[PDB]
Amino acid sequence: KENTGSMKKPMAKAYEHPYNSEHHPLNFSAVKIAETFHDFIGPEQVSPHYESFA
């Protein structure tokens, strides 16, 4: 009886906000500022060497 199980068609999509995006989020937080800050200073400049540069 369980093997006879079927599925219902779900909704196609929810509401899509026309003024909110991932790169231009509508609301503000230090999280997005941190994302842009690290894009600016770039990744941790890892030295592959055996000794420091100085």
Binding site: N27, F28, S29, A30, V31, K32, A34, E35, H38
Partner: protein, 206 residues
């Protein structure tokens, strides 16, 4: 058959009774235990064998010893039909019992959902190690939802740290040695002002 066949039945009833705390439940356990002991009572009396030839020879009324034997043997043939009963008890039973069959089944599904929550959390927690080794915006992604709440504090101008947290533990750690040791009041907004003022017969509102 006689020995060891009731050991398991005693462990079940014992646990069911131990879980009983209210007097009402304890009473039902007594009724339940009686029926089990009633059904599981063992009968051993050494059913004696009848030697009709012995009684037939020593003394008996003509036709009596034989009439008793033939009639006695006829009833001995009759026996219980265990098959028919075995089916009815297994097919359906006590539609009232179906009430708790579906109650305990939903009750278990509730606490199986919680068991899966705690189980899956400890599963995902395996890949998360050393919070001090992750960047800020990456930790918030592991704890999805904090950035959303942080935006709520910002957009409502609740920029007093720990105002909406019931236990602002971070606020107690910073005030361990502060003058006028105090933490922000619950849900305090930096814009609300409940100040009052009154004029009395005396000066300064006194």
């Amino acid at each position: 058959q006689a020995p060891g066949n009731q050991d398991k039945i005693l462990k079940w009833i014992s646990t069911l009774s131990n879980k009983a705390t209210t007097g009402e439940s304890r009473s039902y356990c007594t009724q339940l235990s009686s029926l089990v002991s009633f059904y599981n009572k063992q009968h051993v009396e050494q059913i004696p064998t009848i030697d009709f030839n012995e009684w037939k020879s020593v003394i008996s009324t003509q036709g009596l010893v034989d009439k008793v034997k033939e009639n006695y043997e006829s009833l001995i043939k009759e026996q219980y039909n265990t098959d028919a009963i075995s089916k009815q008890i297994s097919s359906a039973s006590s539609k009232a019992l179906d009430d708790i069959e579906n109650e305990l089944s939903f009750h278990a599904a509730i606490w199986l959902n919680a068991y899966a929550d705690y189980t899956m959390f400890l599963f995902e927690l395996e890949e998360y190690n050393d919070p001090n080794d992750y960047l800020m915006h990456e930790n918030f992604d592991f704890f999805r939802g904090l950035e959303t709440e942080l935006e709520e504090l910002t957009e409502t101008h609740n920029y007093i740290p720990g105002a909406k947290d019931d236990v602002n533990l971070r606020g107690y750690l910073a005030t361990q040695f502060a003058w006028g040791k105090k933490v922000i009041s619950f849900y305090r907004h930096p814009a609300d002002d409940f100040k009052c003022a009154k004029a009395t017969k005396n000066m300064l509102g006194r």
